[PDB]
Amino acid sequence: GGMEVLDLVTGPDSVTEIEAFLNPRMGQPPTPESLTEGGQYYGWSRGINLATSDTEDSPGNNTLPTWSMAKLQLPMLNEDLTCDTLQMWEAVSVKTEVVGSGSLLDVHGFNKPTDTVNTKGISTPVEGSQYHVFAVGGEPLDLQGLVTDARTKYKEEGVVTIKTITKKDMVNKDQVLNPISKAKLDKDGMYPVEIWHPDPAKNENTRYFGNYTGGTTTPPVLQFTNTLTTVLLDENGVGPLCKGEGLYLSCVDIMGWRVTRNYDVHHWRGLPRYFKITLRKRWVK
Amino acid sequence: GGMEVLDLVTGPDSVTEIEAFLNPRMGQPPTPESLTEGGQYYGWSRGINLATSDTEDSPGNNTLPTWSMAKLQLPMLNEDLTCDTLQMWEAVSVKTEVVGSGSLLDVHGFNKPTDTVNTKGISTPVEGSQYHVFAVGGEPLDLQGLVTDARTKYKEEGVVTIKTITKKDMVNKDQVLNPISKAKLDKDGMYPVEIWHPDPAKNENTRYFGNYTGGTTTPPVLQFTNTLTTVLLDENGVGPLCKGEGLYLSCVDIMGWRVTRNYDVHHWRGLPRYFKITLRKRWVK
Amino acid sequence: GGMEVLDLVTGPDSVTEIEAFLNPRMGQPPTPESLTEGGQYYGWSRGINLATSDTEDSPGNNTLPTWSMAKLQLPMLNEDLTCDTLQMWEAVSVKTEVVGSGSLLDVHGFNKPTDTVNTKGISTPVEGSQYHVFAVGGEPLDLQGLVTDARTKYKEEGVVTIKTITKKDMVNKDQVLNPISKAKLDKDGMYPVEIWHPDPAKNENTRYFGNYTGGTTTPPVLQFTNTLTTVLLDENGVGPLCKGEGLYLSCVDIMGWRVTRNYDVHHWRGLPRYFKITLRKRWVKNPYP
Amino acid sequence: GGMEVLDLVTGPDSVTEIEAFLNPRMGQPPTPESLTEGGQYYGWSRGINLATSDTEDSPGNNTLPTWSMAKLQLPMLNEDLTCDTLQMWEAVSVKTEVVGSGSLLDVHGFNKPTDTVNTKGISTPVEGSQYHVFAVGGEPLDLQGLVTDARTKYKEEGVVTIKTITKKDMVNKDQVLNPISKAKLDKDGMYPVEIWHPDPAKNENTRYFGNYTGGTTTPPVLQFTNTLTTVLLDENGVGPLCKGEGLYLSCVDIMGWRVTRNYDVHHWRGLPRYFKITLRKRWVK
Amino acid sequence: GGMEVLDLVTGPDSVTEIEAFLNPRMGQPPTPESLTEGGQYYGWSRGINLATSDTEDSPGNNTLPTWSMAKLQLPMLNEDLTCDTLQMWEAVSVKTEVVGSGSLLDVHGFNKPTDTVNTKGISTPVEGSQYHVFAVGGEPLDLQGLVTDARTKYKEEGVVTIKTITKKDMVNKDQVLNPISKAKLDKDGMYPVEIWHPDPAKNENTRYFGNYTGGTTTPPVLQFTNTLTTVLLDENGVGPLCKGEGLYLSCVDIMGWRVTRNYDVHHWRGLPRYFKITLRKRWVK
């Protein structure tokens, strides 16, 4: 009925918790699992390939980090759907954490060494551009497309890009804000983060939080604790409401790149994110 | 009547919301739209040209980032204007956000490579000087001119500079604070940000927020969330009042520069800003 | 099993304070103590050894920093565990501090010099990647394994790795989150920090706080004061409970590396951490099986 | 007579506002105004000159940034001065802002270029050591002298140094805290900031706020908004009192240095600071 | 007697304020005062001398920064010493400030120049590792020894080191936390800061605040204002109590190093710290 938020439902089972972890989608898929057939790159992207000229930029799909997303089912609520007043799940808060930064302390590998003159020192740790965004909502995250170069030739299959949505080539307006270029995060590991951003004009039922730090050798920084709670309630004390009984989790956590000893080839590094959402039942008209 | 702030108007349609996005004005105009005739630079400036001597500094108009601005209409109020007490629109708060920082993760292009020796590594991402300013008011943003060099030879057409206002050449005082060098942000993409700054001596009906980070290769930093509200009310609980039912939005969001493989040519990069303003009617004398 | 938390116990000895310091476990064990037989590296790791190829990475055990931990005995409370209502120790807060950052001001040693042309300047101070984590709980810290490379050939004896737990080689999923790879921090100086991380899915009775800063030459940063208290109480005002009356302290505090004059060999530097835990007795409905 | 603070005066004209802007004093005076005779350096210092030996360091006065200051008249108060209870002006708060950071976005000049191999790239922007201090009080800001080198041969004319005050050469104690080396900020553009610092042992009637960031190429950082109020009231709710009915404003705002294409000559850059002070009348014994 | 904290004493002279400044102890003593015989280094350390081998590290005493400290007398209290309830001085808060950062703006000296090829640019300002610690208490600051190298050969006279206390050579445990290595800061300019740290296991009657930033060329950062009060009261509202009517002040403020033109010789630079402590009388059992 009319989306008028009423009281908080009380009684047995009116509150619940949902846990989930989303693994990064940096480029290399989970399979093959073989550590000699490509599996060794899981959690990373494959070697970043550069444009050959100002008009020929064709990045490989497996070199492009994409959004991670999961749709989780919540326990049922309404029997009589035609009642004037119904119940709905409401996301109150979430404890989220990026796991694994300690693994970046491995500086004993075969990356580009710190002393390139003599090929000594330590294996250079992951550094560079970082990007962390997470969202919790009752609908898929609304995306707004914006790219560095509208001339970039993305593969037509394997990834969802602006052309996939509009059925036409990107225009110059796509390098700034073009209202026509919109989509929804409805698939895991398919929407490149260099193209799709959270849409501030929509997302009425989703709360998203993002931050970016660029550069080429910028030190990665991360905090992690099980004592930090992120409030999802808006200024009116109402959190995201699940209209379809399915909760949406979205995220991307890029730590930077590792660099090889062969022509400075860069590989993106991503880390998994944990979510623990507290939900409660809400009376809605 | 007299400028005395009274009570908040109550009743149907006493509160409203206005949304809008302002695209950056880095130098290259929206047209030509062709990706081979200049449109590929939309969202960026054209290649920055340098002075030829200590007395010959003539920057091209399309290399100078300018302020973005928009004037939005508000629904009408006053039936009888000659009344002792009238209603005025008052800006309470704004949810603003710079969209597209994820696009800076595109490091597969044709920019100056990180490994110049072998022309390998990755396409160097946008880095350098950053500038973010946004304002909301009931009048155009009041500007105060101040430049690096009063001898700079800006074009007389295509841009609004100190000379445009005073009808005379800049004087040495224009390198510090000269009360004579003032203007108002009344046109989009015309007032250069290296010349025009928010005037703290005026702007009684505007709230502006700005920050600057300089340097040549400083890592760009940006946060974005749909949960942050910017309060526009002053110390007395009063926000900007629309004296003429036209809301003014002003902004500039420079992320740094990208560098080409041809003589380190720099191109400024800017991103669009979204605004969602909450307004309420106010009884005024 | 019905962990129902009730009132705070009042009266004589209802509140207590535990103190302890945990020394870093960077690689070189406390012994031999001799300053010419290896003891001179205590507080540091031994020289970090690098992989010989993309498929041959065998780090030495003494080059891998591991978690520090201690289990402290609390005064006994319940002689009989069959009582409907019992008392349990609850951790309220902790004053913790990493000690010794001032020692990093020693730049008169024999590390790689800042003027390499003349072998002059100062002895380069410790810089680079930093990692600081501490935890207090009523059970061992729950760990989730995740590594940079599942092909890394860790020694089988001397350290507890994913293989030690699963009895099988690591799989590609171990480079991301693989639920199967879990363990508990039950031994000091045995679990490598580049492998084991606090498990957010568990640790229901432990509070952990960690931060990481990477890079190769990043300046080390640290604050220390005896005026800062870390609250251990959760959103409901209930801190970690000790069901077995053994309190667990865990930590790792890496300041970065020092670099020698011989082929830029790096040595991890760690510093000791102090803990002062405030505890109180809590009445609880019998949670014992 | 006695400084016993009583009630706040109420009634017509019991509160007032004072606005003022202080231009920077980096070295080059406001005149000559000619852009070919030296006026082109206004807002900057002249080229920094280095010591010729460990015992011969004599900086030119026009290369040393000095404190900016102004004394402003407040409206009159007492008719009868021989009364037991009088009224004094009290500074409650101040809105202050450093104007012009946007001008630092001019990277198209003739400074040392970022690409020295080809003399290309961009004109290196201002970078380095930054110093920001402002004060508001009822008496001149009390100064404590402390220098890098007690052997520095500061000019005897045109500047106020420690020797000017003591009538004797500096001693080694002047490199640390020497209680004898004190002065008052009673003149604009005369007291070098590398010599004179706010005295924490005095200034009972002044509030000062300062910060320093060193380095040679450190990125300049600055925030500016018309929504930030600095409270001037002390722990007992009392702000600075004007006993002589003359308000003192002091400041210095160094953004760093620009470097020329000739032997890396450095020129300090300063920016003007705006002040809007709110004052109220106070009953005093 | 019984260390029970009761009410605050009221009446005439029940509250007092103590002021003092502590000069830095970087290595060079205050004497000789001569600016040619060594006094020119006052406020700095003498040139840092390096180890000659992995087993021969003998730093000169004048190259080691030590703790600054002062014991201040407070006004008398108790007449009848054998009373059940006595009065003790309690430190409530302290306004502390590091003075002189502006002196670091002197870049016109004879330090290693920024353009070493041509011996041009500016005299490199102080940079590098920074250490700031201050304490206020009713007893000497309790110290815990911890060094980088237990093999370091510190001079036996002129400095108080671990061996001074234990009468035996340092052991490997001294590189971590060895409970045996403890001392008290009872002398000014004698305890090296690279050896002695605040002891968290003691100092029940002292409040200490410290921070450290390492690196070789890290920009020095510092804030200073007379508006910041540091609370010395613990969680129970009780501040440090002066048991033997002697207040202790301790500190160290290292800003970094300046580098000479001769073999990159480094000299530590320290700055003085000001203290203004507010104390009140307390009734104690």
Ligand SMILES: CC(=O)N[C@@H]1[C@@H](O[C@@H]2O[C@H](CO)[C@H](O)[C@H](O[C@]3(C(=O)O)C[C@H](O)[C@@H](NC(C)=O)[C@H]([C@H](O)[C@H](O)CO)O3)[C@H]2O)[C@H](O)[C@@H](CO[C@]2(C(=O)O)C[C@H](O)[C@@H](NC(C)=O)[C@H]([C@H](O)[C@H](O)CO)O2)O[C@H]1O
């Ligand atoms: C397996 C293989 O060789 N595939 C070819 C593609 O190359 C691979 O592309 C990947 C990204 O898509 C990675 O860059 C691969 O690099 C790594 C990797 O696997 O991650 C980097 C690792 O560090 C390295 N590991 C080690 C230990 O060294 C591995 C390792 O060497 C190999 O896995 C085993 O040998 O390699 C990289 O090998 C190649 O991209 C594609 C397609 O090539 C095209 C394209 O479509 O992009 C063909 C087009 O016709 C051409 N277009 C034009 C106009 O010329 C483009 C163009 O050159 C390119 O866009 C420029 O960048 O190339 O072919 C596969 O066969």
Ligand SMILES: CC(=O)N[C@@H]1[C@@H](O[C@@H]2O[C@H](CO)[C@H](O)[C@H](O[C@]3(C(=O)O)C[C@H](O)[C@@H](NC(C)=O)[C@H]([C@H](O)[C@H](O)CO)O3)[C@H]2O)[C@H](O)[C@@H](CO[C@]2(C(=O)O)C[C@H](O)[C@@H](NC(C)=O)[C@H]([C@H](O)[C@H](O)CO)O2)O[C@H]1O
């Ligand atoms: C097309 C062309 O060459 N036009 C001339 C102008 O040059 C262009 O100026 C732009 C800014 O106004 C950009 O700098 C252009 O550079 C880019 C660009 O288009 O953005 C940089 C891109 O990275 C590059 N792209 C690629 C893929 O390489 C493109 C690309 O090369 C071209 O678009 C393809 O053709 O180029 C740049 O080309 C030039 O500025 C003007 C005016 O020149 C004058 C002036 O009036 O300023 C003439 C004066 O007589 C002279 N005065 C004196 C005293 O010497 C000044 C002086 O040299 C200058 O002020 C110093 O900077 O130059 O002429 C157009 O014809």
Ligand SMILES: CC(=O)N[C@@H]1[C@@H](O[C@@H]2O[C@H](CO)[C@H](O)[C@H](O[C@]3(C(=O)O)C[C@H](O)[C@@H](NC(C)=O)[C@H]([C@H](O)[C@H](O)CO)O3)[C@H]2O)[C@H](O)[C@@H](CO[C@]2(C(=O)O)C[C@H](O)[C@@H](NC(C)=O)[C@H]([C@H](O)[C@H](O)CO)O2)O[C@H]1O
């Ligand atoms: C005592 C000795 O030489 N042991 C050999 C190992 O060397 C030692 O390894 C340590 C790490 O485990 C440190 O790197 C040692 O370096 C230091 C140190 O003691 O910490 C660095 C100090 O800075 C230095 N001090 C000074 C003042 O200079 C000291 C000092 O030189 C010595 O303490 C006294 O001389 O040295 C370092 O000495 C060495 O790592 C192993 C290697 O053996 C193997 C292996 O890893 O098992 C054998 C394998 O068969 C081989 N595998 C393959 C496929 O080749 C691997 C492979 O090379 C390796 O994985 C590559 O990294 O090496 O041998 C010990 O005998």
Ligand SMILES: CC(=O)N[C@@H]1[C@@H](O[C@@H]2O[C@H](CO)[C@H](O)[C@H](O[C@]3(C(=O)O)C[C@H](O)[C@@H](NC(C)=O)[C@H]([C@H](O)[C@H](O)CO)O3)[C@H]2O)[C@H](O)[C@@H](CO[C@]2(C(=O)O)C[C@H](O)[C@@H](NC(C)=O)[C@H]([C@H](O)[C@H](O)CO)O2)O[C@H]1O
């Ligand atoms: C006109 C002239 O050359 N005068 C000499 C002085 O030089 C000027 O000093 C200024 C600072 O006081 C600036 O550094 C001037 O540099 C600039 C400038 O004007 O700002 C830098 C600009 O970037 C540059 N502009 C351009 C576009 O290039 C301009 C420009 O070149 C000129 O303005 C054009 O004319 O120049 C700089 O020219 C110089 O300072 C004095 C030094 O004299 C003494 C002194 O300190 O009084 C004499 C003493 O006896 C001597 N002591 C000893 C023991 O030798 C000291 C000592 O050498 C000095 O302290 C070492 O640093 O110098 O001489 C004038 O002739």
Ligand SMILES: CC(=O)N[C@@H]1[C@@H](O[C@@H]2O[C@H](CO)[C@H](O)[C@H](O[C@]3(C(=O)O)C[C@H](O)[C@@H](NC(C)=O)[C@H]([C@H](O)[C@H](O)CO)O3)[C@H]2O)[C@H](O)[C@@H](CO[C@]2(C(=O)O)C[C@H](O)[C@@H](NC(C)=O)[C@H]([C@H](O)[C@H](O)CO)O2)O[C@H]1O
């Ligand atoms: C005057 C002189 O040469 N004295 C010798 C001592 O050298 C002095 O040591 C100081 C630190 O204790 C500084 O490093 C001195 O450097 C400066 C300074 O005075 O601060 C640096 C200044 O920048 C510079 N000023 C200028 C304008 O250039 C001044 C200036 O040059 C002079 O002041 C003017 O003459 O110099 C530095 O001069 C030296 O420390 C002592 C003792 O030497 C010993 C020791 O440590 O006891 C002797 C031992 O026998 C030896 N041990 C071994 C095993 O050989 C050690 C060993 O070499 C050392 O441990 C390695 O670091 O040295 O001798 C004086 O003669």
